[PDB]
């Protein structure tokens, strides 16, 4: 045996799918891959002991009912290779809940009743991406959910695994803590003359206490699943979250826990969009330089943090000049 062929990159070995139709199981276009596996498989992101290693994590599109299978062409034998294969199955079991199915027949049996899946919580926003060309239109909804919603706790356990693959320093939250808020994005779709809901992404926000009587909601985790990225959903989600908290006088403004470069770019885009038509951000105001009243209006109208209001100023100042 060539042992080099028994070390495998876990970023390409882990195959993720979101399944709406049985044909999605055989369509490689529906397969997407982790950006991070270092929290399970080390800095090198490798598993040892298998050739042709495939780690299948397939999810029903809405409910995220899970199939988990480990496949391989061959593995090391301790009698002849004198070493044991990595416990890939046990490592994955550490970050997915029990009760997953282990074969495509049982997975397809669950897909038959996926029409029963409904979004959790309170509807905040509906939006459509309408064809300019006489083609397909797509329709999305954003909900605020909590652990009082039937089935949400178990769904969140299935969903949170995705953070390990897509956020470098993801860690699982304490859902017993009542200060956690949850914002969900679904896509509506039709199947067999019914209307179903597909999970698109989500955000967790910690309602951080500011003594004596205020909060400063902190964006903790935000994920738009790979197939939905770069299509405006993250911007709709962060805008909807700002608009939600805007209705609470006890909310000061919104921050983030350890924001990524991609998050900072998205936040700048969203907060510039919200501020651009505010009177304090007019061209004539911008040309006179940054004024505190810009941060005051941004905080009052949209719960924008003073640091972020200064960035909005800098970007809008660049926009009104050559």
């Amino acid at each position: 045996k060539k042992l080099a062929e028994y070390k495998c990159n876990t970023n390409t070995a882990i195959e993720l799918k979101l399944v709406r139709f049985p044909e999605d199981l055989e369509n490689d276009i529906r397969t997407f891959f982790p950006e991070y596996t270092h929290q399970l498989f080390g800095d090198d992101e490798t598993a040892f002991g298998y050739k042709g290693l495939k780690i299948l994590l397939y999810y029903i599109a809405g409910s995220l009912s899970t199939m988990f299978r480990v496949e391989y062409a061959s593995k090391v034998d301790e009698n002849f290779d004198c070493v044991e294969a990595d416990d890939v199955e046990g490592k994955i079991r550490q970050i997915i809940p029990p009760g997953f199915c282990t074969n495509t027949n049982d997975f397809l049996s669950l897909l038959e009743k996926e029409v029963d899946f409904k979004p959790f919580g309170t509807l905040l926003h509906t939006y459509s991406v309408l064809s300019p060309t006489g083609g397909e239109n797509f329709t999305f909804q954003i909900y605020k959910a909590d652990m009082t919603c039937r089935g949400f706790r178990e769904y969140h356990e299935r969903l949170q695994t995705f953070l390990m693959w897509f956020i470098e320093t993801a860690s699982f939250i304490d859902v017993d803590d009542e200060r956690w808020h949850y914002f969900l994005v679904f896509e509506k779709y039709n199947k067999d003359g019914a209307t179903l809901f597909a999970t698109v992404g989500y955000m967790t926000v910690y309602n951080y206490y500011v003594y004596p009587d205020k909060t400063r909601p902190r964006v903790s985790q935000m994920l738009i699943l790979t197939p939905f990225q770069g299509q405006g959903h993250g911007a709709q989600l962060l805008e909807t979250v700002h608009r939600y908290y805007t209705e609470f006088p006890t909310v000061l403004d919104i921050t983030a826990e350890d924001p990524s470069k991609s998050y900072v770019k998205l936040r700048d885009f969203v907060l510039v969009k919200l501020c651009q038509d505010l009177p304090c951000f007019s061209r004539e105001k911008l040309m006179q330089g940054f004024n505190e009243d810009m941060a005051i209006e941004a905080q009052q109208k949209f719960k924008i943090n003073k640091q972020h209001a200064r960035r909005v100023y800098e970007i809008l100042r660049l926009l009104v000049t050559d």
Binding site: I167, A170, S171, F172, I173, S220, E257, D258
Partner: peptide
């Protein structure tokens, strides 16, 4: 695990 109110308490990747 992260502390109270934390969802990004995991290890950074070092290549």
């Amino acid at each position: 695990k992260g502390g109270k109110g934390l969802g990004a308490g995991g290890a950074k990747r070092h290549r």
